[PDB]
Design a protein around this ligand. Sequence first.
Ligand SMILES: [Mn+2]
Length: 229
Amino acid sequence: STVPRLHRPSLQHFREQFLVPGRPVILKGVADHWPCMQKWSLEYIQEIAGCRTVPVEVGEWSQTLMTVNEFISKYIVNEPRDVGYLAQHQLFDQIPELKQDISIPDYCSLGDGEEEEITINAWFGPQGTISPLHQDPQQNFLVQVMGRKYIRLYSPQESGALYPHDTHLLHNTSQVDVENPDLEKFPKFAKAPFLSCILSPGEILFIPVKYWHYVRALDLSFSVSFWWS
Ligand SMILES: [Mn+2]
């Protein structure tokens, strides 16, 4: 089934129908006019951030460091040799000027945590980046700025069909490749129900705490996530 889209729902409707029961939703009309939505071209990113060092996940997975200018040159603009992803990086703490182009969603105030503790991560990469199926320990608003992403969501109630890795370090990550699952080794995966969507610019996906999610970029993409409680 498809994740529902709601236009600027009230705080109470979001709380009662999505936050408390832990149900995903896409919020429309919330982030669509944030400055980032019109301002964040590649050229703007290069002007404001190009000389700064960022962590880049390549691939055989490795983590390296390079400037934003290098990342753009090697993994976005020139016919790249491998997939590189500027993933899960607190770019807005590093570059406070960019924080002026985003806002904390008002719905985060329904949480029990402090705004000071909300973690804001950038996710910037070419078409074809993949975040394998995993779950996070806080609520998440994933705001799509540039490009589209295909997202698959499985409830925590389906965890037994997703074959989490046994190591404590990877217990929040599935052993299954969502889009080409090995059903001989992971047969229960096939019948596990899920939601999916294509998340487009200006839209926010609410990923409830511990909801399993898998993400593939369909175009050159930039997302901003807000981890909150
Ligand atoms: Mn995640």
